[PDB]
Write a protein that binds this ligand. Structure first.
Ligand SMILES: CC1(C)[C@@H](O[C@H]2O[C@H](CO)[C@@H](O)[C@H](O)[C@@H]2O)CC[C@]2(C)[C@H]3C(=O)C=C4[C@H]5C[C@@](C)(CNC(=O)NCC6CCOCC6)CC[C@]5(C)CC[C@@]4(C)[C@]3(C)CC[C@@H]12
Ligand SMILES: [Mg+2]
Length: 546
């Protein structure tokens, strides 16, 4: 019968209960028990805290009014107050001490995944403190995981007045019988019970989740760790920068702080960072996920020379210039990783830090040319198959769904065959209708299909068709070293970019930091998104934030 779940903020989704600081303060100050509690609610409906919770006055207006109530309550009890006694100090400490109750949030997220309409209903205030930013970030991180956020000070009503419960029901578009409400204050549950809604008194989280488990018939406690938050493309800010007369770069932007530019590889998208973008922004960074030249909404000129590393790096610099960014952290994967290494070698002043996933830094060989080596090692036969313009394009564009369902697979799910050139292509003995890998949903696959409908594989494959050009350019840097903060991350089950091709990188990057991910294939971002986020946020906070 249940179809919606409503969660209180203080003491339910956030701990410790800021309301509970009043008790701990009395004890720590040797004050009469409940003295600070009575000052908080002195007056009831006609009181200052109700005017605060209703939006009639701001928090900074209310602070001097609570102090007066504290002095009038200490008078009737015949007790003096301390000297440094400061309501602002106490509430500042309490608000910043309050953190998200992760197991409770997980239960709500899980209920939303199974089709529940979730919402937050809380008695809160208009925060105009000098430190209001702290609570703003907390509410932002919580907001995105719920369908509705009902704040008392924004609707002019407070719990337990039954009008706010009637307001929640009209917002939910549900009857009381199909709604469960959780709160840490029993008074706030009676009106709800009176309307007939399922109610849960939240004292300890595990017991409440056990009750919620029973009424919903859905496992919420001890459930597996969920994947990090992903992106909905239509919920993102989309940015467009013309770096050149007929070349425009498209990117997705999220968060504030130092700029972090994410560069995907072949044949991918900004969407390949869907599991990193929210996490990195949440960690205190301004994330710019890019559609690399030739991909998605970025321009895809047909000329091969438009995709040599020198031109791509130049354009990334112009991208920073047009955006007003003097520096950015560059994080790349696969071909994007190759791009960021040479960004650090040719434009160090514009690179705050550089990190690569899977892609090692191998200095060019001034003797042998890349075309000689790709033939001297038949393992790179597919790169020879990619050379002839139009050939690989036809195979990859023939059935886009089949293409990405065949490529985006874990290391235990390989469905592709062998030498590619003299076989006929990449999909010669390959399923025409491959099964769905466990790393991706059918919807995520269809997003890639729709992106690559715009320009096809000409631009992306052109990245492979400047071997000699890039080699001559790279040889100009053979005397340099990378001395800015750098991070290399290797994946064990990556068979195209094996972790041993990175073993000599310290020769050219002495202070290079490393990270390793076990049981991880080539598509690192979606294979092990949780581990990637930890390795990157740890390195950013230690080497990029300064
Ligand atoms: C021969 C094997 C099987 C492999 O051989 C090992 O395979 C097993 C390992 O356990 C053992 O059984 C075996 O004995 C041996 O050890 C070597 C790699 C391999 C030959 C492999 C490859 O190289 C590339 C790709 C893929 C490459 C990507 C993901 C694009 N990314 C890159 O271009 N990145 C390198 C550049 C980035 C940085 O800038 C410069 C370099 C696009 C899709 C696809 C073409 C899709 C097809 C594959 C998976 C491809 C052709 C499939 C075939 C396979
Ligand atoms: Mg509460």
């Amino acid at each position: 019968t249940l179809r919606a779940a409503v969660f209180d903020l203080d003491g339910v989704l956030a701990l410790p209960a800021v309301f509970g600081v009043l008790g701990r303060t009395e004890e720590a100050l040797a004050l009469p028990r409940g003295l600070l509690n009575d000052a908080f609610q002195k007056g009831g409906p006609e009181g200052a805290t109700t005017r605060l919770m209703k939006g009639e006055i701001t928090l900074s207006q209310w602070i001097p009014l609570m102090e007066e109530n504290c002095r009038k309550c200490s008078e009737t009890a015949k007790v003096c107050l301390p000297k440094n006694f400061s309501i602002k100090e106490i509430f500042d400490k309490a608000i910043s001490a309050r953190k998200i109750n992760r197991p409770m949030l997980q239960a709500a997220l899980m209920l939303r995944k199974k089709g529940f309409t979730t919402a937050i209903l809380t008695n809160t205030w208009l925060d105009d403190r000098a430190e209001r930013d702290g609570l703003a970030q907390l509410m932002c991180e919580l907001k995105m995981h719920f369908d509705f956020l009902i704040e008392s000070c924004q609707v002019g009503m407070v719990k337990p007045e039954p009008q706010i419960y009637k307001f929640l029901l009209d917002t939910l578009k549900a009857s009381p019988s199909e709604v469960v409400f959780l709160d840490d204050i029993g008074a706030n549950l009676k009106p709800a019970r009176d309307l007939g809604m399922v109610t849960i008194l939240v004292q300890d989280t595990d017991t409440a989740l056990k009750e919620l488990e029973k009424v919903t018939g859905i496992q919420l406690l001890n459930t597996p760790a969920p994947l990090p938050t992903s992106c909905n493309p239509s919920d993102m800010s989309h940015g467009y920068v013309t770096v050149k007369p007929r070349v425009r770069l498209h990117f997705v932007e999220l968060g504030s702080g130092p700029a972090v530019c994410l560069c995907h590889g072949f044949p991918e998208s900004w969407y390949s960072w869907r599991y990193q973008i929210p996490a990195l922004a949440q960690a205190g960074y301004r994330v710019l996920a890019m559609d690399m030249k030739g991909y998605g909404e970025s321009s895809a000129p047909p000329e091969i020379e438009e995709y040599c590393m020198e031109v791509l790096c130049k354009e990334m610099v112009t991208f920073l210039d047009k955006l007003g960014l003097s520096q950015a952290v560059f994080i790349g994967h696969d071909w994007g990783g190759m791009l960021v290494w040479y960004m650090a070698l040719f434009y160090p002043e514009r690179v705050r830090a550089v990190a690569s996933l899977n892609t090692p830094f191998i200095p060019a060989n001034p003797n042998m040319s890349p075309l000689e080596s790709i033939k001297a090692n038949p393992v790179f036969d597919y790169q020879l198959y990619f050379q002839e313009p139009g050939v690989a394009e036809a195979e990859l564009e023939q059935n886009l769904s089949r293409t990405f369902k065949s490529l985006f697979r874990a290391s235990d799910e390989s469905v592709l065959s062998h030498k590619v050139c003299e076989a006929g292509g990449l999909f010669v003995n390959s399923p025409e209708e491959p099964s769905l890998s466990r790393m991706v949903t059918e919807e995520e696959i269809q997003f890639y299909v729709q992106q690559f409908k715009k320009s096809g594989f000409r631009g992306p494959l052109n990245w492979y068709r400047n071997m000699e050009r890039n080699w001559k350019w790279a040889c100009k840097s053979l005397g340099r070293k990378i001395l800015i903060p750098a991070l290399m991350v290797t994946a064990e089950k990556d068979f195209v970019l094996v972790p041993q091709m990175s073993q000599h990188m310290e020769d050219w990057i002495p202070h290079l930091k490393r990270g390793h991910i076990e049981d991880c294939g080539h598509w690192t971002q979606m294979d092990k998104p949780t581990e990637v986020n930890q390795i990157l946020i740890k390195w950013l906070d230690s080497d990029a934030r300064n």
